[PDB]
Design a protein around this ligand. Sequence first.
Ligand SMILES: *Cc1c(COP(=O)(O)O)cnc(C)c1O
Ligand SMILES: *Cc1c(COP(=O)(O)O)cnc(C)c1O
Lengths: 363, 363
Amino acid sequence: LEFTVSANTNPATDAVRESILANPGFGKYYTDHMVSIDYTVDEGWHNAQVIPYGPIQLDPSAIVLHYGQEIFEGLKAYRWADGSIVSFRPEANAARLQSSARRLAIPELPEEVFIESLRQLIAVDEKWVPPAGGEESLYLRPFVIATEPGLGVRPSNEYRYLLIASPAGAYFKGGIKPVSVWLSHEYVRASPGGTGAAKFGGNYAASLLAQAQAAEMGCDQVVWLDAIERRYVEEMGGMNLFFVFGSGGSARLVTPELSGSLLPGITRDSLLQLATDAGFAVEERKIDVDEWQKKAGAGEITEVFACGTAAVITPVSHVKHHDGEFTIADGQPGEITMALRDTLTGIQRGTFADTHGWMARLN
Amino acid sequence: LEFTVSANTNPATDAVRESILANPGFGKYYTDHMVSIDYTVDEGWHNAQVIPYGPIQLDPSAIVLHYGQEIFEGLKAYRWADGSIVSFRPEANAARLQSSARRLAIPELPEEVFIESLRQLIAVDEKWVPPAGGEESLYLRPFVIATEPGLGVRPSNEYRYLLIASPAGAYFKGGIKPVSVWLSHEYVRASPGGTGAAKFGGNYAASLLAQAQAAEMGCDQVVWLDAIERRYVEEMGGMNLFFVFGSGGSARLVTPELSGSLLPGITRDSLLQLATDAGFAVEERKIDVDEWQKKAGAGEITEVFACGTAAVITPVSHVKHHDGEFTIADGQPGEITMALRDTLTGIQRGTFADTHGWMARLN
Ligand SMILES: *Cc1c(COP(=O)(O)O)cnc(C)c1O
Ligand SMILES: *Cc1c(COP(=O)(O)O)cnc(C)c1O
C-alpha cells in the first residue's frame, strides 16, 4: 500500500504548537495532519494518504451514524534522548484492532499497514512529539468507521480508517493522586456473548450513566462487576485492575482473568510480565467484593491500582459500594504501584532496558 | 423553535424522482431535503433548519465517531385518500427518543420540536410521499449524534439532531412470506440494566455476527434469548415477537413482557390493544424455548409472528436452535397474524376507524 502526502499549507504556528506542548491536557489538541485509508469490497484497502487534519465528510445515512459500527485503538509515541521516536508495543494494538474488527463484522486492517500508518503520520508531525524525558507524549488514535449509506441493518461494505494524534500530558486530573471508586450495582460493562473484549465505541456510550452515578455517590470512578453474578470485580472505567497482596520482594499480584468479556489491556499484559521480572508472583483469577473488603481491612491487600495507556497506572485508595465502604492501606499510593509505574514509564522513555523488545522505532 | 428553510437548488428531476417512486425499495433513496437542529450548552437546541439533503461534516475527533454516543427512531408518513399526509403515533416516537436519550446521556428533544421537524420536512418533500390506496409509504428516520470534538470519555456537550426520509415501497412485493429463525446460543442482544430498552446504534453493530451466524445455520433471522438464563425468548432481530395460542375468536396472544432490556416497540404496544379490541385475550409474560417447541408441536401454539415499523408484521414459520428444530403449524402465515396485520395497516392507511386516535396529520 502506497501513501500519498498532501501537506498542510496552514499548520499551527511554532508558537501555537509549543504552547500546546507546554499544556496539552488530553485529547484536546490535534496535530497538523491525519492518515486516511478507504475500503470497498472491490478495491479493499486503498487510497491510503496523509492529509491535513480537518472535517470529515459523511452521508446522512452513513451506517456509523445509525448503527454504530465502529472501533478504535489507543497507543503513544515517545521522543527519546537520541532524538529517535518510538512507540510502546504498536504491534499489539495492530492485532487488537483486528480482533475488535472481527467482533464488529468489520474488515481487518493488515498489521503492516497499521504500523505504516503510524510511521507516515510521525514522518510529517514528528515535531508534535513532546521533548524526551517526561510524562508527556503523543497519543495516537487509530479508528475505523462504517461509511456506506443505506438505512438497512447489516455489515457495511465501505469503511474509512483514520489516524489522528493528540499531545498528552496527563489523563486524570490527579496524576500522582489516588482515586476513589464506586462499584456499580445498577450497571454492567458487558456480559457473556457481548462486545466487552472489543475496543468498541458502543461500550463507552452505554457506560456514561454509570460514571455519572459513581460521581453522584461521591466517588471519582466507577468499577464494574461481572454481569452474571454481580460479584466479581472486572475493571475501573476503561482501565484494568490489579490487587497487591503483601509487600516487598515477596509481594504478589492478583488481577481479574480474561473471562472473554474483559478487555485484554496491553498495559495489563505488560505489567504482569514486569511483575514477574521483578520476582513478584502473579495470578489471573476471579476476585469478589467480599474478599476485597475483607482482605483490605485485614491488611493482606496492601495496594490496588488501575492501568491503561492514557494514565499508565492510577492508584485506587477508596472503595464504596451498595453494601459497604473501606479505604486501602493508608489511602496513599502504594510502594509496588509506584515501583511498577516507574519501571514501565522508564522503559517507555528509554531510561531502563527494554529486554522484551516492546519499544518499536517509528521515526 | 423557528425553522429556516434553504431550498435544494439541485433537486431530483421529475424523471428521477418518478423512477425512484416506481421502484423505491427501502432505505436506498432519500428525499430532496432533511431537517437539522444543533445543540450546545449555552444555546440548547437552536438553529433549526430545513436544508438540502447532502453530506454533513464532522471533526475527526467527534465523539460519535469514537465512543458511539448516538440514538435513532423509526416511523412513517402516509398519504390518504383525502389528500392529507399522516403519521402513525408520532408522539410515541418522540417520547421514546427522549427515553433513549436519557439512557445514553443525551439531551432530550422536546416532543413539540420533534413533531414540528416532521411537519417541516413533509412541507417541502410532500411530493416524495407515495400515492394513497397502497401499502407504500415514506420512512422517517429521526436521529441524534454527539458532535463535540475531544478524545476524553464523557457525555458530549454538542449534538446534532437530523431528520431524513426514504421512500418505502410495498414491503411484501410477491405476497407476504414467512421467515425461519435461529435462536442465538452464542450471542445476546442486551443484559440487565444495559441499553436494550433504547434505540441505540451500539445494540445493532454488536448483533451483526449473530445475524450472520443465523444465516450460516440456514435461517433467515436470528432470535434473541435472555442473557441471564439463556432460555427466555425476547425478540427477532430488531422486531418484537408474539405467540398465538389457539384460533378463532377464542384465540389468545402471548408476548415477552417489558423486562427492562426489551425494546418497547410501538407496533407491539399497538397490537396488544388491537388484539383486545378484537376480543382476544392477551398476556405479557416470559416464555422459554421448551414451552415454545412443546406447545407448537402439540398444536397449542398455532402461530408466531414478529412486528416492527418497517414490516409491520412478519410471520415466523420455522424455528431452529441448539437443541432442536420445528415448524409452526403448516408453515404458512397464520389466520390471526394476517387478521391483525390487515387491521393495523388498515388503520394506518385510513381504511378502518382510528378509535384510539393513533393517526396524526402532518401535511
Ligand atoms: C482500552 C481499554 C483498556 C486498556 O487497554 P490498554 O491497551 O492498556 O490501553 C482497558 N479496558 C477497556 C474496557 C478498554 O477499552
Ligand atoms: C425499533 C425496534 C423495535 C420495534 O419498534 P417499533 O416501534 O414497533 O418500530 C423492536 N426491537 C428493537 C430491538 C428495536 O430497535
